[model samples]
Target: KHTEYMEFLKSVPTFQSLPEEILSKLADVLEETHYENGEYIIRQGARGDTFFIISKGTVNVTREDSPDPVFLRTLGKGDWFGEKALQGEDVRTANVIAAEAVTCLVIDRDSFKHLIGGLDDVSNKAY
Candidate 1:
């Protein structure tokens, strides 16, 4: 179990500091969700509460109300999104859509604090 949790943690740059014990505890709180292609994982301006890690397939990240959503970025295996939710960025600045069928592990804000207290430093770096 530690191996699996550690492996997942290694894949995410932000969570690198998290110890195995914390991840092991976090494992129980995460939930797995599947999204079909073109599905909106989350929309802009909505309050974000979940941090998502893409385990399989790609997802597009872009702003809302923009032409073509700007194609700001994409997330594939081992990539993560919606991290701002942890820092109280309730209004999602962008929309994420499944570029293909996607499998994600979702950890709520509470779970994040349980594992790592609001990582302001790292969150600012990514933003």
Candidate 2:
């Protein structure tokens, strides 16, 4: 099942503190998606319900605070984003585009909410 992704999750700050059982359950909710180079992964101003972990390739992060979105940086394997949506009031703060072919593991909002409810309070920790 999610055995392969489990190890990777264990190393991610946001998911690390959760119990193995919870992690296993969370893993079940993960869906894999792929993108080609230059594809938009997340668009600024859109309501976002999913969190993403990059499993392969690179992505570019851009913010729309200016008239034109400004390039922020590039992310590659093991990088993750979209957790801000977990707070319930988040519209996407940035755009993420594939810098190259990319594979990502995704978890929807409902699953993320359920996951947090089952875990210990992690407010003191940085994710």
Candidate 3:
């Protein structure tokens, strides 16, 4: 089941440079979550502790400056988000909504930090 997850992780630009062993480790820790169209995956100002990788469908990235939230961009397969929250103890800076039914591979803060912290080659790469 996770073979596809490993392949997807390898395809993500940020994780591409990691050694195969590291990628395998990462793939092993990931778990999946699903969302329907128009569902809010993550909301602006929410506590951020999880990182998400889109495995299928599209998501809209938005911000809260305007009353209706300003549009940022759309993300699809292999795209990822919530990484900034891993850099420090911070709240989510944007809203992630499912533009279509979506599937995501997720890792929590502890697991993410543990996995990335062990990889010296990818430790410096910013998400």
Candidate 4:
């Protein structure tokens, strides 16, 4: 299971350069959550602490502000979201709505920092 998770984590752009041991710990701390279709998964302008990896179904990314509202993109399996929270951003950028029922492998900011703090100081802090 760890091996499977490691491979998948490597596919994620943010975690691609992370070492195997850290990835192993990430696999250990990963959690799953589900969302119903049309549900708001990540709300724009809200403070967010959780990161998500879509393992089942899809979500529509959208932005509502300024001159016009926009449909950003559709994310599916192997896609991740909420990265801004990990970097201490003030609010979420987009509203991610479940286009279909969704199952996600999620981790909160605390667990992410706990695992990452294993490093003396991580150099590549931006994604």
Candidate 5:
């Protein structure tokens, strides 16, 4: 059932390019988690364990050094984060906060290796 949900993630445009093998690995590894508004998903410089694919609601990514954390971007349903982990950087560059009640499918690092390695498009794409 978890894999089935990751399959549904294929409906997202960026993810439409993922390979079947990757999707299968994602199915085995992904699980859902919910956050209330104002909840922090990732803290600046902290090691991130699981990457997230947002399923509902929104998220704001902000830097920590300024007087006010500058909003870097907004990610809504069908988008994902923690790609830094895939790039082998464990430290989060910014804080990710739930802009609203949010639901996410979380994929840990080991699963990420399997999934990214299997996806030809993702594999071949320049970093």
Candidate 6:
């Protein structure tokens, strides 16, 4: 049932704007994962099909424009990224690594393409 994800998402500020039924719809495709300290969440140069929203803990970002990746900044709870992958020519532009034990909720493009209208809050929150 979507009840679990629906309930958990209620506490995330970015997702707070989502209609309750929309959040339940999200639960249809929502997935979660945990990372150890320093674990890689997304790697630069890989093909990407998913978007992520941090459920807990912190993650550091880096840009891999050339051969060497440069440190960018840190992202905390509810911070989300990876939209570029869902853009057009899907490519991962950065490396996201866990700064500590972390939990991230993810949705893949195959299932995510139609939800952005209701998912608008996720994009608006980062800006």
**What local distance difference test score does each model get?**
0.77, 0.82, 0.83, 0.79, 0.78, 0.80
Which residues of candidate 6, in runs, are more than 4 Å off? 1-4, 117-127
Please report the TM-score between candidate 2 and the true structure. 0.83
- Put down candidate 2 lDDT per residue, 21-106, tens digits, no spaces: 98898788899999999999999889988888898899999997755789898989987777765664778888999999999999
Clashing pairs in 3: none
lDDT of 5 by residue, 64-88 (tens): 6745777788989987777674665
What lDDT score is found at residue 8 in candidate 4?
A: 85
Give per-residue lDDT, candidate 6, residue 90: 89
lDDT of 3 by residue, 46-98 (tens): 88888888999999999978447889899999777887667766688889999
Output the better candidate (3/5) by TM-score. Answer: 3
Q: State the lDDT of candidate 1 residue by residue for 14-121, as single tens digits.
A: 667767677677767778899999999988888877888787899998885643566678889887788765675577888899999999988888776656555654
Question: In model 1, what lDDT does residue 111 have?
Answer: 75
The candidate with the higher lDDT, 5 or 6, is 6
**Cα lDDT of model 6 by residue, 20-81, tens digit:** 77777788888888998999999988999998888789999999665578899999887788
When superposed on Cα atoms, how far off is each prediction in RMSD?
2.6, 3.0, 2.9, 3.9, 3.1, 2.6
Best-first order by lDDT = 3, 2, 6, 4, 5, 1
**Estimated TM-score for each candidate:** 0.81, 0.83, 0.85, 0.76, 0.81, 0.82
Candidate 2 positional error at 21, Å:
0.5
What's the lDDT for candidate 5?
0.78
Model 5 spans with C-alpha error above 4 angstroms? 3-7, 65-67, 117-127
lDDT of 1 at 87: 72
What is the clash count for each candidate, in the order shown? 0, 0, 0, 0, 1, 0
Clashing pairs for predicted structure model 4, backbone only: none
